[PDB]
Amino acid sequence: QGQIIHHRNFQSLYNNSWVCSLNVIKSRDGNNYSALEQAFNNILEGIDIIECENLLKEMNVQKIPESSLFTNIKEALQAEVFNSTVEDNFESFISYELQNHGPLMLIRPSLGSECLHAECIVGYDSEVKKVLIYDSMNTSPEWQSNIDVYDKLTLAFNDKYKNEDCSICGLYYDGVYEPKLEHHHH
């Protein structure tokens, strides 16, 4: 024949991405999450994303609460609309969430819907209309355009891309997070 095929188990690291994302949102000040020291932290024979919901709760990670801005963004996401008005609302939404709730973890379908994928929104600058993304399937943190992040949100929030195991999909935060109120002299 000239056909040689070995039969071996495959593991995707997509399933490990929720653990990385959990560390991002639970950690502070460039350290790791202090309660790290279970299958939880295993590469092989660990906990798949689809199974992680109870563990997220136990780490005081919760879905972001309902709000007018969030309702408005979801409506635009469902309608597949992007314009200056949607972008203004997106900026206001991401800014409020980052300020008040801290870094967000997004759990979403992979493009093509094979696997779930977790990544984090860690920062925003209105000066350049870019979002700081920590996606552990990349080699490093990346600043991405608003439209590129909007496309990621579309997979999590537009009904075209959702099914039953997608109840876990959405935006999460560290329930322990409190903003630090800075004072300036001038």
Numbering used by the authors: 21 to 32, 41 to 65, 72 to 220
The authors write:
In S. Typhimurium, which infects a broad range of hosts, another effector, GtgE, plays an essential role in virulence. GtgE is encoded within the Gifsy-2 lambdoid prophage. GtgE is a cysteine protease and contains a Cys-His-Asp catalytic triad. The critical base was identified as His151, the nucleophile as Cys45 and the third residue as Asp169.
